[model samples]
Target: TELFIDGAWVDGAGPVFASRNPGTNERVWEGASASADDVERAVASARRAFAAWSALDLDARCTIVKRFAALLVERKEALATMIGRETGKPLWEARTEVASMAAKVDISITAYHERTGEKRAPMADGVAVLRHRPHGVVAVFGPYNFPGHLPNGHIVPALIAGNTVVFKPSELAPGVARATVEIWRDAGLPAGVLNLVQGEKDTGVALANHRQIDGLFFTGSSDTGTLLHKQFGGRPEIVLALEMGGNNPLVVAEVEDIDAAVHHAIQSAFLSAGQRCTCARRILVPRGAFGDRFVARLADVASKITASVFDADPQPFMGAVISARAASRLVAAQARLVGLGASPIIEMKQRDPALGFVNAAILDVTNVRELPDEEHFGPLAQIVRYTDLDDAIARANDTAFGLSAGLLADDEQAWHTFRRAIRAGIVNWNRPTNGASSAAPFGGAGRSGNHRPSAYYAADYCAYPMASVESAQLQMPASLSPGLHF
Candidate 1:
């Protein structure tokens, strides 16, 4: 795939690398491996474009964004197919990612209207005015898991707020990024307004540390995000936004329908091959006969679910882990549970090495302390048993990452108690943790994010707030206000 830079398709300076399809263990597409020179060029283009782009009116900016939204809907199927091949997400889930782009575009349009548009202010004379403007150039880093949606969440809003972008997508899934950028270019956006640079860690580092960049937006692990933060340390002039990983949790209270709860758990843990940041890696269930029943039901469902590669009408259940290395990591995590005395309720048969498919496993950990306090990033679920509801709530919050949490219960009081006590950014009752709306802000507290939520509030981070004051007298400001003297 070609890299979009300066509003045109261009080849990278370095050799191309193969991005493999995880399901089939085949080279899906060749992505241009960007070098330091490519990054410099991209940043230079963004810097040059920022002057004219940021000067445009908010209404004109929003018009381009609205057209981009329409173009995305027109090519949703093609985008989803590319997402599924590169990222190994299910076809249906990949489509959902593309569908959310429209909602995000609308959200950005509304935010620009409300935040930057005309507002009433206290005036000394006949004039009353309030104004907000965009920052300069923004550098966006996309994650491998949600390639199309996450980057679009930042790029669209940045464009709508009148900030040109230099985007670097994850090397593992560059196709979706390329396709989405192509859609923007086809929507009649100006040259150099949106640029795409494809590469791994080195390329991202170059973009983030580029001197011309006015802001940084990223979604990935907290470790890397922290490094980026330190890179921008003391340079408070540059804006930074991060949406890192999470160790999400789910709690099960008294429920009459065992089948329904099991279904929810399966979908939450195994969806997108358990790659989502919001997927529930640790589950808390009360210690009783009900808990035992729930475990049995979940185990049965896990065993029956089918795993396959990405093709038309693929398997209904899970897909391969991102790669063989990722599959090895999942095995290591599962082995840790076994070493700590947690027993596997259902163990799926390993797939053929040629196919690159891996099975899901469900483990029952009687001791909650053994589980790690971060995301596992694969199809493995550890069920932690608790005796009291209060204890379960406490254990669920015992993690450095607090992104999303789920509570399933029939009792209203129990649901209310869990909702009030849980500390995650997104909480759901009788639903899985993976469900999120584009209309709401999608981020978390603690290590989950840097307090800069995306989605609805994404426009807030993409631009800085500035107020303009207009007066009838040109040189009366110093006389009117005693604090200033000119």
Candidate 2:
């Protein structure tokens, strides 16, 4: 894979970093480590291409993006394989990510048309028009969990809106990013319009502070996002969109089928090894006889689930946490919970060193005070027992982070009341928190994001709207009328 710059693939002087397969604990691919000098070149390339790229009409930009979309669909299988191998996602889920690319491209195309095209207006004296334009060169940083889909969600829209991009995918999963860049090149997008750079933390800092970079878009932890925000110091000229961490919560309020709710809970917490930002990390349940029953059922289902690599047929019930270090963090977090008086109902017994797969665990805590408010980025769920419905809602909103929440209930009135009161950006009814629709806004308030949701609302973050006024007639008549008063 080449480090794309100035419309061509080039080599870097920095050493190559090995991207490992978390499931097998083996090096999957070796990616070039982009140095500060390499980032300077990428930023310089984007700055050079910005003027010509942003000057093109929206239709011209859309045409190029549509071609890119076609190319993505044509090479979907290879892309999915790369994503699965590098990121260790189940093959089926990887394919879904590839299929979603076409839909996202369509959404970008539709949004561009509606926001910039001609529309009817009630005006006799002057025309009323709304113009949406690009933000010049954009610097995008991708997360390792969903390397291709998450970043492509930004890259496609940015390009469709006529903005050139300098992308740096997470070092943990650079192969998917490199593969997507190849597809963009095959689509015949002009060189320098889309560029790729790979590196660790230092590479990201250099790109974020690059002088010519007009905007910064990121999807990762809240701590890192805050550091990036401080790096800019609210500069008026540079635009920033950060999809930070999420501490998503799910509440079970007397569901009809106890078995079904247990299954949903297990799937939500253990899926993707709980790597998704929207995964249910905290589960709130009412304390009573029903709560005890629910806990027992949940424990039974969770204990039965197994973890494996992407190659397993029928797809393993789970995969490895991003790395052994991440697994160690999960172990420490679980230990802390137990130390704070939380009882572990079901613990993952298998520490399979050979396969690098850690089993799932479900912990129950009577009081919410002991559980930390931070985002736990692995397959561990903390169940909080609440005395009443209000207490459950209060415990759910107690966290500083609010990205998404789910309510499992049969009562219509309860659902309505909880939905209105929850502070999460995404609210789900009778479903897990792991899934989200591309048509709706996908961000949270507080530490979750800057309230600029991605997906359908991504266009809003990628570009700023400008109001243009053109008048043929001058104020000459005002001068003539003023002469009479004189």
Candidate 3:
């Protein structure tokens, strides 16, 4: 494999690297990092392609974008397998990622027209019009968890808005990016419309610092996203859309069905090995027998979840983390919490010493003095017991990240109160915290994002609005100011 720059596969001119399957511990893809010069070339290509590409009618661009979607359907299985191998996601989940990537095109098209499309209205003497124009050349930085779908979310909308893109995928999952770029190429997308620069921090820095880019779209941790936000400071001309991690909370209170409540908790906390940004890290329950019962049942169910390879027979509920090192970090984080007097309901254990497999675990942090507000990015859910519903809402809004929060209860009044009090971008009632809709805006406020939401609202940041007043015939005003001349 090689870098996809300027619409063709070429050898990178920087340090060589390889990506391994975290489950099998075997190298799946190898390629060179795009050096400063390569990144410059990719940006220049996108810049050069902008003129002709953006000049085409919107329908013409949509035609090519639709072709890309069609190709995704044809090669769904291969794409899913590649995603599974590179990111350690199960085949079934990877299949959904591909499907989401395909669905993004259609959704983006509708969102484009509704959110950022042209509009016209009659005026007394002229016609008032509002139109949206694409940013010249934008860059997309993808994360390892949802490498294909997340980046596709930004790329599809940016392209549909007529902005050429230079994509820098996560170093941990470069193969999926390569395969995706290949599909775009096979779809007959014009050269330089979508360029892939494969590398780590250096490559990303080069792209972010490039003077030619008009905007940047990022999806990853809050630390990295904050740095990018600061890096682009004093440059208001550049559009930046950052989607960062969250110390999301899921409050389960006054639930009638214990089984269904546990199921929602598991889906929010352990799905995708808990790599999702919206995955519930802090689960709040009432401090009493109800909470005790729910906590115990959650621990029991989490303990039973099997961690296996992507292609394992019988299909485990969860797969390995991104890598063995990532698994170690998560385990160490859990250990630190335990050392701080946190009671272990279900101890997090590494299923394989060499592989990135960790069992879902729960820790009781109710009595802890102060807990760090960090997104653990794994299958470790902390149980925080609360005496009152108000206290639970306060605890849920305590974190700097306000990405996602959920309440699982049957009381409509309680749901309404919690909804108004919670301070997260995504607030759900009786639904998984990580469950987001492509048809709606998806992002958070404060440290979670920069206020520029993505998904259905992506078109807003991809283009800028221009309002104009037009008159086919050039004529002076019927009555002019005393000092004005005709």
Regions of model 3 farther than 4 Å from truth: none
Q: Give candidate 2 regions above 4 Å deviation.
A: 115-125, 349-356, 475-486
- Residue 89 of model 3, lDDT score: 98
Best by lDDT: 3
For candidate 3, the TM-score is 0.98
Estimated TM-score for each candidate:
0.94, 0.94, 0.98
Which lDDT tens digits does candidate 1 get at residues 1-486?
Answer: 377778888888766777788877778668667788898888888888888888877677778888888988889889988888876777877788888876688887886676556576766643566666678788999988888888888888888888889888888887788888888888888899998898877777778878878899998888888888888889988889888888888898899987888777877788877788888888788888999889888887788777676554754566676777677667777777788787777653347554446687877777545566765577778788998889999989989888899988888999889989998888988888888766787888888888888888887787666665666576533255565645
Tell me the alpha-carbon RMSD of every candidate. Answer: 2.5, 2.2, 1.0
Model 2 whole-model lDDT (C-alpha atoms)? 0.81
lDDT of 2 by residue, 86-113 (tens): 7778777778788887678888777666
- The CA lDDT at 238 in model 2 is 87
Residue-level lDDT for 146 in candidate 1: 85
What would the per-residue lDDT of candidate 3 be over residues 1-486, giving only the tens digit for each residue?
387777788989989989999999999988889999999999999999999998999999999999999999999999999999988999999999999999999999999999999999999889999999998999999999999999999999999999999999999999999999989998889999999999988998999999989999999999999999899889998899999999999999988899899999999999999999889999999988988899888888887898888988988888999999899999899888888889888888887878899989898887788899896589999999998889998999999999999999989998999999898888899999988887999988779999999999999999999999999988878899899865
The per-residue C-alpha lDDT of model 2 at residue 109 equals 72
